[PDB]
Amino acid sequence: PAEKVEEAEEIGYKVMGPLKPSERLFKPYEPVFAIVQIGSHQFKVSNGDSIFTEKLKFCDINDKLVLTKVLLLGSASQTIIGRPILPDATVHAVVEEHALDEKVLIFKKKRRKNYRRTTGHRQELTKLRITDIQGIEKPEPKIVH
């Protein structure tokens, strides 16, 4: 159990447990962004975004995630630059699906040599919904009456 937590931390996520039906985590859009690293790939996200990552092995559907590798934070007024990561910043997410992508055909042929090969491949991806960015000050509610 701790080994899976350590490996998920190496990838850059932490499982916080299942999403309860009482929680309302899908709030309206806030003008802050974060850059997070999940595996080899980096994503620049705001809340309400969706990202497709390479398959995360240690989470299930509707699990709340904390993304542990935050490289940059930004807003309309300031930018916080991590060298390389920001330990005090947290980005929250929810696992939405694990699905296979559309099949790609791998075709090889060498002309006049009586050689050809055809095979398929389907890559499995994990879809995450970004719900919350922490570590940078969000703008106040400007109740324009």
């Binding site: 999403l19 985590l25 994503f43 309400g48 509707n62 930004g74 699905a99 991806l125 879809k127």
Partner: protein, 118 residues
């Protein structure tokens, strides 16, 4: 689950009690199906006898999409894997993913234009 709402609504287990190609789904019904039924209280699982036909699993989703996976001559673990992939799916059409970052607000500070001053 799309924003916390589970998308797969019904799992149809179609099988034959006579045919040799339904051995794996019959073993799946006896062995792995109650555990999957227990772990998914939000999912309705119905089982249908279809004599003389090859077995399949059918997944009916919130968006009224239906996906059928034939499981003829499969081992029970392959049937369980297919049922798990049906449960983990959002029911979308199998087409190429055009992007891996879906956003409606690409810019917080405003997109670069020729009018931007620094």
């Amino acid at each position: 689950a799309l924003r916390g709402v589970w998308q797969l609504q019904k799992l149809v287990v179609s099988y034959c009690n006579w045919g040799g190609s339904s051995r794996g789904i019959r073993a799946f019904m006896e062995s792995e199906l109650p555990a999957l039924i227990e772990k998914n209280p939000q999912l309705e699982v119905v089982t249908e006898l279809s004599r003389g036909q090859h077995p399949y699993l059918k997944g009916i989703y919130r968006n009224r999409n239906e996906r059928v996976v034939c499981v003829k001559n499969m081992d029970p673990d392959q049937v369980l894997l297919n049922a798990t992939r049906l449960r983990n799916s959002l029911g979308r059409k199998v087409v190429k993913l055009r992007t891996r970052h879906v956003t409606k607000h690409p810019s917080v500070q405003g997109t670069w234009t020729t009018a931007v001053k620094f």
